[PDB]
Amino acid sequence: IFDYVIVGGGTAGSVLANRLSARPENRVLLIEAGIDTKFFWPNLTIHRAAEHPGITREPQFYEQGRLLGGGSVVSNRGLPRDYDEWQALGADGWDWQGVLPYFIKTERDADYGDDPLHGNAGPIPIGRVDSRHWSDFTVAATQALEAAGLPNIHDQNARFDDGYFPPAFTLKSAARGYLDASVRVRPNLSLWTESRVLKLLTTGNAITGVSVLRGRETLQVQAREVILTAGALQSPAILLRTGIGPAADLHALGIPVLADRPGVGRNLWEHSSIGVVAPLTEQARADASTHQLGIRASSGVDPATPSDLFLHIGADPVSGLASAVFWVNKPSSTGWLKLKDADPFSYPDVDFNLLSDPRDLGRLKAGLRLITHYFAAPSLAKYGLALALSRFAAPQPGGPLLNDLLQDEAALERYLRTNVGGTWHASGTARIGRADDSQAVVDKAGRVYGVTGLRVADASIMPTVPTANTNLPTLMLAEKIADAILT
Amino acid sequence: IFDYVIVGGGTAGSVLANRLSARPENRVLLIEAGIDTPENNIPPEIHDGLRPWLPRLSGDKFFWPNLTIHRAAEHPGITREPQFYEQGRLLGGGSSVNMVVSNRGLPRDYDEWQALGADGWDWQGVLPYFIKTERDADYGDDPLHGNAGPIPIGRVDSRHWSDFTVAATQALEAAGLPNIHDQNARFDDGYFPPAFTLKGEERFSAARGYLDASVRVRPNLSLWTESRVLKLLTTGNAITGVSVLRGRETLQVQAREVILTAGALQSPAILLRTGIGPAADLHALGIPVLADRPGVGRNLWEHSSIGVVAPLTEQARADASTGHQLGIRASSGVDPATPSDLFLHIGADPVSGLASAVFWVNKPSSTGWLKLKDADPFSYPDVDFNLLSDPRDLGRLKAGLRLITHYFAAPSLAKYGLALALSRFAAPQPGGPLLNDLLQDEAALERYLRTNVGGTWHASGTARIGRADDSQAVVDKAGRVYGVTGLRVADASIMPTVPTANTNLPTLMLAEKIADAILT
Ligand SMILES: Cc1cc2nc3c(=O)[nH]c(=O)nc-3n(C[C@H](O)[C@H](O)[C@H](O)COP(=O)(O)OP(=O)(O)OC[C@H]3O[C@@H](n4cnc5c(N)ncnc54)[C@H](O)[C@@H]3O)c2cc1C
Ligand SMILES: Cc1cc2nc3c(=O)[nH]c(=O)nc-3n(C[C@H](O)[C@H](O)[C@H](O)COP(=O)(O)OP(=O)(O)OC[C@H]3O[C@@H](n4cnc5c(N)ncnc54)[C@H](O)[C@@H]3O)c2cc1C
């Protein structure tokens, strides 16, 4: 009988395996469906933009890590206001002051590790490119940003106003930080790779372990506590197949209901993305030859949500393209997922419902206007780049000219509703909330309401997606939950 | 016949006199009601920059005598009284009598000025004029700063901080606030050594910056001190001169353009008396309406303020010795649309024996108005700042008091054992209720705040820039008054909103920009 069985060995699971097995008396098992460290869940499709008249949506492949260390290189925290809002929404203690010590605990900052908002002893090394190694292309971009009044904020992780910066990244995954060779040798930590949890085992309303598919056979593993860290799409599906979720939906599938929890699979957040590309002219190719540049900006669409855009300006001599890709980093739209059926091998039916709130369409237009503004500044205009729209994930030629789409706002709206993407920042499907909030799924230490023996401790638990790439925040949150468990 | 007559030789007037007279062909007269402050004879209570509070201890001497205002919105169960409102009356105006702090606000303030219909007045647009005004002693080489302008700006070295200040910073670090170092090129929440204008120990007003001996020698520049403009001279809808009281004699001065830079309470009164204002108000006083402009005297902004004080305990007084020290930009959480809506100072004064935490709402929702009492050129306007008319400002003030509580509970500050009590902002003194007791009694706190809420001398917005089709607008993007010709306003009156800032540096900026628009 294990003390803790952790379901899924990705970013959060690795943290928890490490932290919980640090105590010799904790017998811990981490189960991961992928290989030890093609690399994704095969044939996993999702609906992207909200159903809309005139537009025809199809299912799209959505990459989710399927390997030890999972989704884990850009490594950023978000803003104080994100975490203060998590507390306002019922995540007691998850305000900025509450999460900041866990952001510190996770990291070793090469550049700023002695500053009071940083760590210098954590397992995840974080650093930035020296802004002196910047290409002349990047420099020209910074001169255009300067002319609009943007400072170089240097360190996006301890300075929170609008501006530009060298992006912080982890380069030497969460597997090599948290499951290094010292940790894997621990006697009390087991680590099953290529092994897939099928179902949670229950005794009444207690979860008592898991059924696992390992090699060719199905095993039962008994457990005092089960922690789901299967990801924001699969953790809530596991909950739903277990009978934890909206009763009517489960009864429709013949699933016996352990607890009627209407928040399970709701509150699906993402960041809404789009690209702009141009072929590199010769000056631009040459200048680019000498993660460079991130930009935090405000769209002005909603005064309540400053710093709601993230943009990256870059040039790549290899594909022969300049690009400006960006996303809505503080959105208003949310989606949902539900089961297709009770089969443990089925993926859920996922609808991100992107641009369902028209403020997000407003934000993408504003971002596009900002990009035309910057590239009109002399130091970027000199390159004579011809900017065309593209999908965020597949930045390639084929889209219409930026300057011409902005002059046809109905055509602009059609293009964005058709081609809007995600940034793989799926979150919020098993959210933290108060004991008397009927849409909450877990308490402030990840314990699932309505049952015993079960926590959730991955990106599913985020009350909202933060103003950030979701890997560092997930590491933080796993750190915080581990500490609460250890009590 | 002057090309430009500038009414009011204060912060903006000084800038405009200097910039417009830089071209030999421009015949410029600057008219100032108060005394001269020439560099060889600055009054000692003005010249002392380490004690900028001293003009206020000289009484009336350096201010508009007996200028009174209404402060807090009328509210049932609280009577309010007229209160004296300091406004500079001498060359350099407000910058000759101020607390010497020099900050810009935030990009969002000016981006909002553009959204409100002030085209060109966004952050990108005002930034070059902020750079032009300053020579920053600490960061003048950096991208968002200047190193060659006439107003020197600097900060205390953090090394030189008292142990008390240092303890306060530890308390704020525990709250997760960084030292932002430079409040004028970094715009997130946190704490900093405030930026201020001084030349060594001496005050450095806009008069010293812009009206020095080398500029006063200009033969095309005229400067009339102890001379008070009474009326604008009008021929149809064109303004064509001024009448001026000099001693007991009244004179007329002809002008191609008149620029009003008389301050945010007096510039709009001049407009109203000329017949440029809401028509029904003017009819009621029998002033002939030259142009029906309902925004004149509306849109009066301010920063709403309160203090918290405690007797210095032994350790606190000792810690206070060792070395404008510490400012704090913070968010109230009242409205997610207005981050950084609070400003706080924490310090210890061994003279009074008082530690204090004074703060104001730096992005308010409430606005007030002024109107004329009568047509007499010598009367002051009827001014109602209408503070806490919008309940969110009450919430911001309660939120800042809670923030102050939290900070002072930190070990670095708790060790001092300070008994924090409420106070009016302008005159910090005993007599107010204990902070911790009054936060246990919301209705008592309300009544206290509504009774004792103060301003910060950041009056603004009473002749606002706005769009050529906006009934509430008074001036265009270059300060030209809609409905007449020959008249501009170029002072703090024209700000569409008060920024997240003490208003001296933003006024210098706006006068630089307006001068430039004029010269093009
Ligand atoms: C291609 C891509 C690029 C990204 N880039 C970045 C980036 O640059 N910066 C950033 O901050 N974030 C980025 N993200 C997002 C970030 O990686 C995720 O938000 C983060 O990994 C979420 O952590 P998690 O622990 O919730 O889930 P995951 O890290 O996805 O871990 C879930 C794990 O559970 C396993 N699993 C699922 N079901 C079962 C089962 N039944 N039994 C056993 N195991 C199971 C999966 O195989 C997986 O290993 C990226 C994501 C992707 C997909
Ligand atoms: C006591 C005090 C302390 C302050 N502290 C600071 C601070 O530390 N930092 C900061 O940024 N801001 C502070 N301020 C605010 C800042 O000083 C003002 O907002 C700024 O001076 C406004 O400039 P202005 O040109 O609009 O008006 P003013 O500087 O007030 O200039 C108006 C001038 O016109 C003159 N005038 C008026 N009517 C007539 C007339 N009929 N004829 C001739 N002349 C006339 C006046 O005598 C005055 O000189 C302070 C203000 C005061 C009063």
- What tokens appear for A101 in the block? 């010590």
Beta bridge partners, A153, equal none
CA dist A419 and A415 (Å) reads 6
**What residues in B contact A161, CB-CB < 8 Å?**
186-188
- CB under 8 Å to B272, separation ≥6 — which residues? B281, B282, B287, B296, B297, B371, B372, B381
Beta bridge partners, A336, equal A266, A351
- CB under 8 Å to A73, separation ≥6 — which residues? A169, A170, A171, A291
| Nearest-Cα residue of chain A relative to residue B127 | A149
- CB under 8 Å to B244, separation ≥6 — which residues? B31, B224, B227, B228, B229, B230, B250, B251, B252, B253
Q: Please tell me whether residues B294 and B346 are part of one structural domain.
A: no
- What tokens appear for B101 in the block? 């702090």
Q: Is B400 helix (H, G, I), strand (E, B) or coil?
A: helix
What technique determined this structure? X-ray
Between the alpha carbon of residue A269 and those of residues A364, A428, A432, B161, the distances in Å are 16, 6, 14, 46
| B127 touches A: beta carbon within 8 Å | yes
Burial class (CB in 10 A: 0-12, 13-18, 19+), B214: exposed
CB B46 near ligand 2, within 6 Å: no
Shortest Cα distance, chain A CAs vs residue B154, angstroms: 19
Closest CA to A391 of A330, A331, A326: A326
| Nearest-Cα residue of chain B relative to residue A144 | B124
Residue A118 · residue A157 · CB < 8 Å: yes
Q: Kindly report the number of other CB atoms within 10 A of residue A272's CB atom.
A: 28
Q: What is the dihedral of CA A329, A335, A339, A345, to 10 degrees?
A: -20
Longest dimension (CA), chain A: 70
- What tokens appear for B507 in the block? 């006024």
Q: Kindly report the number of other CB atoms within 10 A of residue B232's CB atom.
A: 25
| A100 touches B: beta carbon within 8 Å | yes
The answer to whether B504 is a known ligand-binding residue is: yes
Which of B144, B181, B340 is the best mutation test for A, with the most CBs of A within 10 A? Answer: B144
Burial class (CB in 10 A: 0-12, 13-18, 19+), B433: middle
CA dist B260 and B120 (Å) reads 21
Residue B509 · residue B516 · CB < 8 Å: no
CATH of the domain at B270: 3.50.50.60
| A317 touches B: beta carbon within 8 Å | no
Q: Do A298 and B108 touch (CB under 8 A)?
A: yes
- CB under 8 Å to A361, separation ≥6 — which residues? A355, A413, A416, A417
The alpha carbon dihedral of B479, B481, B482, B485 has a sign of negative
- What tokens appear for A267 in the block? 């509150």
CB A9 near ligand 1, within 6 Å: yes
CA dist B143 and B195 (Å) reads 17
The alpha carbon dihedral of A328, A330, A335, A336 has a sign of positive
Pairing between β-strand B327-330 and β-strand B342-349 as defined by DSSP bridges: antiparallel
Q: Which domain holds residue B436?
A: 156-203+303-362+390-456
Q: Please tell me whether residues B30 and B79 are part of one structural domain.
A: yes
- What tokens appear for A34 in the block? 């992928």
Residue B136 · residue B122 · CB < 8 Å: no
- Map tokens 């809505």 to a residue: A328
Residue A448 · residue A73 · CB < 8 Å: no
**Residue A170 identity:** T
Single residue among B456, B478, B501 that ends a domain in this structure: B456
Pairing between β-strand B227-235 and β-strand B238-246 as defined by DSSP bridges: antiparallel
CA A61 to chain centre: 16
Closest ligand 1 atom number to CA of residue A468: 11
φ, ψ of residue A480 to 5 degrees: the values are -70, -45
- Map tokens 């005002």 to a residue: B126
Which of B144, B336, B338 comes nearest A151 by C-beta?
B144
- Please tell me the distance between residue A400's alpha carbon and the centre of ligand 1 in angstroms: 33
CA dist B133 and B155 (Å) reads 17
- Map tokens 């305000």 to a residue: A95
CB B89 near ligand 2, within 6 Å: yes
CB B17 near ligand 2, within 6 Å: no
φ, ψ of residue B72 to 5 degrees: the values are -85, 145
CA dist A119 and B415 (Å) reads 28
Closest ligand 2 atom number to CA of residue B506: 11
Q: Please tell me whether residues B283 and B371 are part of one structural domain.
A: yes
- What tokens appear for A55 in the block? 């537009």
| B267 touches A: beta carbon within 8 Å | no
Which of B184, B188, B334, B341 is the best mutation test for A, with the most CBs of A within 10 A? Answer: B188
CA dist A357 and B302 (Å) reads 36
The answer to whether B32 is a known ligand-binding residue is: yes
- What tokens appear for A112 in the block? 């700023």
φ, ψ of residue A477 to 5 degrees: the values are -65, -35
Q: Which of A7, A63, A72, A170 to mutate to test the pocket of ligand 1 (most atoms within 8 A of CB)?
A: A72
Q: Is B20 helix (H, G, I), strand (E, B) or coil?
A: helix
- B406 has catalytic annotation: no
Residue B517 · residue B24 · CB < 8 Å: no
Q: What is the dihedral of CA A116, A120, A124, A129, to 10 degrees?
A: 80
Beta bridge partners, B68, equal B84
Which of B111, B143, B175 comes nearest A300 by C-beta?
B111
| B123 touches A: beta carbon within 8 Å | yes
DSSP B264-288: TTTHHHHHHHTTEE-HHHHHHTT--
Where residue A265 falls (left for φ over 0; alpha for ψ -120 to 50; beta otherwise) is left
Q: Please tell me whether residues A285 and A418 are part of one structural domain.
A: yes
Residue count (chain A): 487
- Please name which ligand lies nearest the alpha carbon of B511: 2
Residue B266 · residue B15 · CB < 8 Å: no
Pairing between β-strand A321-328 and β-strand A272-279 as defined by DSSP bridges: antiparallel
Between the alpha carbon of residue B105 and those of residues A7, B261, B506, the distances in Å are 50, 21, 8
- Please name which ligand lies nearest the alpha carbon of B228: 2
Residue A363 · residue A333 · CB < 8 Å: no
Nearest residue by C-alpha to atom 31 in ligand 1: A10
Q: Please tell me whether residues A476 and A350 are part of one structural domain.
A: yes
Q: Kindly report the number of other CB atoms within 10 A of residue B157's CB atom.
A: 10
Between the alpha carbon of residue A175 and those of residues A21, A184, A311, A482, the distances in Å are 15, 10, 29, 17
CB A231 near ligand 1, within 6 Å: yes
The sheet carrying B68-72 orders its strands as: B83-84, B68-72, B381-387, B369-372
- What tokens appear for A7 in the block? 């379901």
- CB under 8 Å to B149, separation ≥6 — which residues? B131, B132, B133, B134, B135
- What tokens appear for B295 in the block? 């925004």
The answer to whether B90 is a known ligand-binding residue is: yes
Which of A81, A148, A149 comes nearest B339 by C-beta?
A81
- CB under 8 Å to B285, separation ≥6 — which residues? B372, B374, B375
- CB under 8 Å to A318, separation ≥6 — which residues? none
Q: What is the dihedral of CA A172, A177, A181, A187, to 10 degrees?
A: 180
CA dist A232 and A460 (Å) reads 4
Closest CA to B345 of B168, B500, B186: B168
Which of A83, A154, A161, A301 is the best mutation test for B, with the most CBs of B within 10 A? Answer: A161
CA dist B205 and B225 (Å) reads 16
CB A424 near ligand 1, within 6 Å: yes
- What tokens appear for B397 in the block? 């003030």
Which of A88, A149, A303 comes nearest B123 by C-beta?
A149
CA dist B115 and B300 (Å) reads 19
CA A469 to chain centre: 5
- Please tell me the distance between residue B287's alpha carbon and the centre of ligand 2 in angstroms: 27
End-to-end CA distance of chain A: 21
**Residue A190 identity:** S
CA dist B463 and B481 (Å) reads 9
CA dist B264 and B495 (Å) reads 9
- Map tokens 């400072």 to a residue: A151
CB A245 near ligand 1, within 6 Å: no
- Map tokens 């812009």 to a residue: B210
Q: Please tell me whether residues A150 and A27 are part of one structural domain.
A: no
Q: Do A97 and B189 touch (CB under 8 A)?
A: no
| Nearest-Cα residue of chain A relative to residue B177 | A117
Over the Cα atoms of chain A, what is R_g? Answer: 23
Q: Is B488 helix (H, G, I), strand (E, B) or coil?
A: strand
Q: Kindly report the number of other CB atoms within 10 A of residue A8's CB atom.
A: 30
Interface of B with A in 333-352 (CB under 8 A): 333, 335-339
Residue A231 · residue A67 · CB < 8 Å: no
Q: How would you write B161-185 as a 3-class SS string?
A: CCHHHHHHHHHHHHCCCCECCCCCC
Q: Please tell me whether residues B231 and B286 are part of one structural domain.
A: yes
Between the alpha carbon of residue B391 and those of residues A31, A305, A387, the distances in Å are 54, 22, 48
Q: Do B189 and A149 touch (CB under 8 A)?
A: no
Chain breaks in chain B (C to N over 2.5 A) after: 323
| A378 touches B: beta carbon within 8 Å | no
Interhelix angle A96-106/A471-486, nearest 10 degrees: 100
The answer to whether B337 is a known ligand-binding residue is: no
CA dist A266 and A250 (Å) reads 14
- Please name which ligand lies nearest the alpha carbon of B9: 2
CA A248 to chain centre: 30
CB B98 near ligand 2, within 6 Å: yes
* Resolution, angstroms, 1 dp: 1.9
DSSP A249-269: HHHHTT---SEE-TTTTEEEB
**What residues in A contact B124, CB-CB < 8 Å?**
147-149
Closest ligand 1 atom number to CA of residue A31: 43
CATH of the domain at B345: 3.30.410.40
Which of B111, B188, B335 comes nearest A159 by C-beta?
B188
Q: Please tell me whether residues A44 and A158 are part of one structural domain.
A: no
**What residues in A contact B145, CB-CB < 8 Å?**
none
Burial class (CB in 10 A: 0-12, 13-18, 19+), B200: exposed
Single residue among A374, A408, A423 that ends a domain in this structure: A423
Beta-strand ranges (E) seen in B80-132 are 83-84
Q: Do B176 and A117 touch (CB under 8 A)?
A: yes
Beta-strand ranges (E) seen in A280-403 are 294-297, 309-316, 321-328, 335-338, 349-354, 388-390
- CB under 8 Å to A435, separation ≥6 — which residues? A443, A449
Q: Please tell me whether residues A75 and A201 are part of one structural domain.
A: yes
Residue B352 · residue B428 · CB < 8 Å: yes
φ, ψ of residue A100 to 5 degrees: the values are -55, -45
Where residue B34 falls (left for φ over 0; alpha for ψ -120 to 50; beta otherwise) is beta
CA A388 to chain centre: 27
**What residues in A contact B185, CB-CB < 8 Å?**
151
CB B134 near ligand 2, within 6 Å: no
Which helix (H) or strand (E) segment is A360 a member of? helix A358-375
Burial A115-152 (b: 16+ CB within 10 A, else e): eebbbeebbbbbbbbebeebbbbbbbbbebbbbbbbbb
Cβ contacts of A134-139, under 8 Å, gap ≥ 24? A134/A166, A134/A292, A134/A293, A135/A287, A135/A288, A135/A289, A135/A290, A135/A292, A135/A315, A136/A286, A136/A287, A136/A288, A136/A290, A137/A284, A137/A287, A137/A288, A137/A290, A137/A315, A137/A322, A138/A292, A138/A293, A138/A313, A138/A314, A138/A315
CB A31 near ligand 1, within 6 Å: yes
Q: Please tell me whether residues A163 and A254 are part of one structural domain.
A: no
CA dist A260 and B333 (Å) reads 34
Q: Kindly report the number of other CB atoms within 10 A of residue B333's CB atom.
A: 19
Q: Is A182 helix (H, G, I), strand (E, B) or coil?
A: helix
CA dist B161 and B322 (Å) reads 7
- Map tokens 């405000």 to a residue: A298
Q: Is B409 helix (H, G, I), strand (E, B) or coil?
A: helix
Closest CA to B52 of B194, B222, B255, B234: B194
CA dist B274 and B377 (Å) reads 10
Q: Which of A6, A11, A107, A460 to mutate to test the pocket of ligand 1 (most atoms within 8 A of CB)?
A: A11
Number of folded domains that form chain A: 2
CB B494 near ligand 2, within 6 Å: no
Q: Please tell me whether residues B123 and B180 are part of one structural domain.
A: no
CA dist B115 and B117 (Å) reads 5
Q: What is the dihedral of CA A401, A402, A406, A408, to 10 degrees?
A: 20
Residue A296 · residue A153 · CB < 8 Å: yes
CA dist A262 and A439 (Å) reads 6
Residue B14 · residue B207 · CB < 8 Å: yes
Burial class (CB in 10 A: 0-12, 13-18, 19+), A222: exposed
Residue B233 · residue B242 · CB < 8 Å: yes
Q: Please tell me whether residues A301 and A259 are part of one structural domain.
A: no
The answer to whether A471 is a known ligand-binding residue is: yes
| A158 touches B: beta carbon within 8 Å | yes
Closest CA to B178 of A151, A159, A84, A110: A159
Residue A228 · residue A457 · CB < 8 Å: yes
Q: Kindly report the number of other CB atoms within 10 A of residue B388's CB atom.
A: 25
Q: Is A364 helix (H, G, I), strand (E, B) or coil?
A: helix
DSSP B363-389: S-S--BEEEESSS-TTSPEEEEEEET-
- What tokens appear for A142 in the block? 């910074």
Single residue among B456, B471, B494 that ends a domain in this structure: B456
- CB under 8 Å to A43, separation ≥6 — which residues? A61, A347
Pairing between β-strand B68-72 and β-strand B381-387 as defined by DSSP bridges: parallel
The answer to whether B12 is a known ligand-binding residue is: yes
DSSP state at residue B34 = S
DSSP B182-217: -TTT--SSEEEPPPB--BTTB---HHHHHS-HHHHT
